[PDB]
Amino acid sequence: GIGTGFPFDPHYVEVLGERMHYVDVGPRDGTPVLFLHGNPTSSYVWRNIIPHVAPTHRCIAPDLIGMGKSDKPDLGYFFDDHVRFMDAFIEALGLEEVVLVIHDWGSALGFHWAKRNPERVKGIAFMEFIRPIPTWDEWPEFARETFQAFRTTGSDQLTEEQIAEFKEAFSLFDKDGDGTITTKELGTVMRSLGQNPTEAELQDMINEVDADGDGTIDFPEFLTMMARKMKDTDSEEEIREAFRVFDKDGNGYISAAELRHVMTNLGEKLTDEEVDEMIREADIDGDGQVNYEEFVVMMTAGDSSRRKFNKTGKALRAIGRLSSLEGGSVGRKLIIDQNVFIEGTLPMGVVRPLTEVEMDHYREPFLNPVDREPLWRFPNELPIAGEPANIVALVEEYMDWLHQSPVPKLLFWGTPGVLIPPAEAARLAKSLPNCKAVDIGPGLNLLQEDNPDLIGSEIARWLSTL
Ligand SMILES: [Ca+2]
Ligand SMILES: [Ca+2]
Ligand SMILES: [Ca+2]
Ligand SMILES: [Ca+2]
Ligand SMILES: [Ca+2]
Ligand SMILES: [Ca+2]
Ligand SMILES: [Cl-]
């Protein structure tokens, strides 16, 4: 009967203009034991391990910024964001000597902080920590296809001039060449095409595909929107809508003046006789106009004026695709909207079935879809296949620090595991200094939920070694 209650007095502290939350129970003197959680949990993952440590040693378990009960500022929640907030939080409490019990992304925070302050770390307990992996073949194949979906957004085999066609469509919006599409500069062409959305609608279309966190639209974010998922009918609403932009009078034909207007409304070079040559490749029945079925031809096909037309067609199609509010990153819609990281990824991290009262505590901090930004930034920050480069070099530095650090190290592993397999858990037991490895038997990622009895057991005995 594994307990699920959370009977800890909550404490709060402001850090960098935002407020954070932490548990603080235990004797007030000695060396504090700092618990650091990872994705997608909070302090709730340490609820049945603190009682094994709380009597003898002080236990501090904060929730990361934008998670648990800490404040949720509008940030990208990169790893460097958590470093800045955890750095100022540790010094806000005036801590010096510290013992670290870390897991998942909390281990990346604890180890990186220990490398920069090695004279202030008395002991490190850890399990399923962040490690560099060279190939996707080393990542467990049960979650290899899914964790790719969080990071396979954009660059879906777009080659030749396809990237060069979207960059010309990207040029229709960027008049100041800032590389980013301003929330007003988008509306500058929305008004220029006969429309006029609200400011709420203007930024809502950007809040769908802003993975950078700039609040604006990037070109890599412009590519992930233009996916090749061409449903025969569901994608007919955007080409038909592209036809409505030209056909203003609604008679069913695109006039030469209707064609020249929207193109010259934006930045294009078409005089009175520069538009007749693309009428040739469009007008096939000879009526001097372009109907609907002739229009889908040019939108599905020497680029004298073909370059000019296909350029705008890409931009006009992105307008209708932005208005769909479904042109976001595929990995984002899994974690943000559909919330697959709490509904599917989190339970698959524990081999035993989590209870409804248990997982309900995990849904609590992320009841708003917009507040799930760190839930999606964390998997994209994983050092996998040498990407991201800044994270790989960062984790490969505190691992080089850990190989030579004489501090006591307590490692917990399980079978089959996710981040630390049994094969790697055996090498770390024989390669790291002062390292004793404890096997919990069955275990994946959240080793705290499978055997919280054993985790707090060996830690308690390991605490009294210093
Ligand atoms: Ca711009
Ligand atoms: Ca951006
Ligand atoms: Ca940018
Ligand atoms: Ca017309
Ligand atoms: Ca025609
Ligand atoms: Ca959405
Ligand atoms: Cl993750």
Swiss-Prot record:
Gene Ontology biological-process annotations: response to toxic substance
Residues annotated as domain AB hydrolase-1: 32-331
One term of GO molecular function: haloalkane dehalogenase activity
Record-level GO cellular component terms: membrane
Gene3D superfamilies: alpha/beta hydrolase (3.40.50.1820)
InterPro entries: AB_hydrolase_1 (IPR000073), AB_hydrolase_fold (IPR029058), AB_hydrolase_sf (IPR050266), Epox_hydrolase-like (IPR000639), Haloalkane_dehalogenase_2 (IPR023594)
Pathway membership: Xenobiotic degradation; haloalkane degradation
Domain of life, per lineage: Bacteria
UniProt keyword annotations, A-Z: Detoxification, Hydrolase
EC number(s) per entry: 3.8.1.5
Pfam families the record matches: Abhydrolase_1
Active site: residue positions: 104, 128, 445
Catalytically driven reaction(s): 1-haloalkane + H2O = a halide anion + a primary alcohol + H(+)
Complexes and interactors: Monomer.
Function, as annotated: Catalyzes hydrolytic cleavage of carbon-halogen bonds in halogenated aliphatic compounds, leading to the formation of the corresponding primary alcohols, halide ions and protons.
Family annotation (PANTHER family): CIS-3-ALKYL-4-ALKYLOXETAN-2-ONE DECARBOXYLASE (PTHR43798:SF24), MONOACYLGLYCEROL LIPASE (PTHR43798)
Family, similarity comment: Belongs to the haloalkane dehalogenase family. Type 2 subfamily.
Name of the protein this chain belongs to: Haloalkane dehalogenase
Organism: Rhodococcus sp
Gene symbol of the encoding locus: dhaA
